[PDB]
């Protein structure tokens, strides 16, 4: 888990090979690509309450709002099963109505 210890990226595994007076590691790493642009918001008001995402992040393509995992685009509808509530939408800076 420690960053850049073995492989520049997210580590998956490694393989050893011998060499006359030393060792050679082959590091297998995961690297993301093909970015995109979206509009975000830290929380969602609903009925006064303020929902936050369990694991993921809120995004929008301009018209609708979705929750995705952070490291790979995969939109999903926002349901009560992937969000949790804490308080009312009056102290957070950046809530959006939905």
């Amino acid at each position: 888990k420690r960053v850049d210890f073995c492989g520049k990226g997210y580590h998956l595994m490694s393989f050893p090979q011998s060499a006359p007076h030393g060792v050679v590691f082959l590091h297998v790493t995961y690297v993301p690509a093909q970015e995109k642009n979206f509009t975000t918001a830290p929380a969602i008001c609903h009925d006064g309450k303020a929902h936050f995402p369990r694991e993921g992040v809120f995004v929008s393509n301009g018209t609708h709002w979705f929750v995705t995992q952070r490291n790979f685009y995969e939109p999903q509808i926002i349901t009560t099963d992937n969000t949790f509530v804490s308080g009312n939408c009056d102290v957070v800076i950046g809530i959006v109505n939905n």
């Binding site: 420690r2 960053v3 850049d4 210890f5």
Partner: protein, 50 residues
Amino acid sequence: EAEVQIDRLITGRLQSLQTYVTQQLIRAAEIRASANLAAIKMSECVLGQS
């Protein structure tokens, strides 16, 4: 005997120079260890949460 005196000077300064070089080598080893530590710290605490 001038060459004898020159020989004395030469060996003395040779010893001094060699001692200087050896101290430099030891200190360089210390600094290299510290630099490796710094690189690790800066790659693991700056570029990500530890």
